[PDB]
Amino acid sequence: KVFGRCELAAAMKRHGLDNYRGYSLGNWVCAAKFESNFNTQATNRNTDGSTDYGILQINSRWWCNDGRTPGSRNLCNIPCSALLSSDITASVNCAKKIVSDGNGMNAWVAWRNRCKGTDVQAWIRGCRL
């Protein structure tokens, strides 16, 4: 599913992401834009052989099992394909474990490079929330 900016904002909000760990809604929406262009089906393989899955591009090295990443830890306890669904619930639950982990949203490279320190509030402007 390719979400619309506001539709995703509203879903993430409903899923408890606004201000989750002190990160405002606009951060989460900004990160999804840059990570997957709002497409839940986005996948991208890495040089280490791991693969990033879904709207938030969650890595198979630590967070989910894809059966082909030797040494994967499966911290969110889910198959990576679950992260590609139109229903963003599993991506959000897994992201909440990730962001709690220590480096916060810095775990997301696009967030750090493209979102961090920008007027992220722009991402939820005009939305009915």
Delimit the domains of the chain by residue range.
1-129
Does 101 carry a binding-site annotation?
yes
Active site residue 35: yes
Other CB atoms within 10 A of residue 61 CB: 18
22 contacts: CB under 8 Å, gap ≥ 6? none
What is the residue whose two structure tokens read 């052989």? 49
Residue from 35, 66, 87, 119 carrying the catalytic annotation: 35
Per the entry, the structure determination technique was: X-ray
36 contacts: CB under 8 Å, gap ≥ 6? 42, 54, 55, 56, 57
79: β partners: 65
Closest CA to 36 of 95, 119, 99: 95
Measured between its terminal Cα atoms, the distance across the chain in Å is: 21
- CATH number for 1-129: choose from 3.40.50.300, 1.10.530.10, 3.40.50.2300, 3.40.50.11540: 1.10.530.10
Q: What is the resolution of this structure in A?
A: 1.7
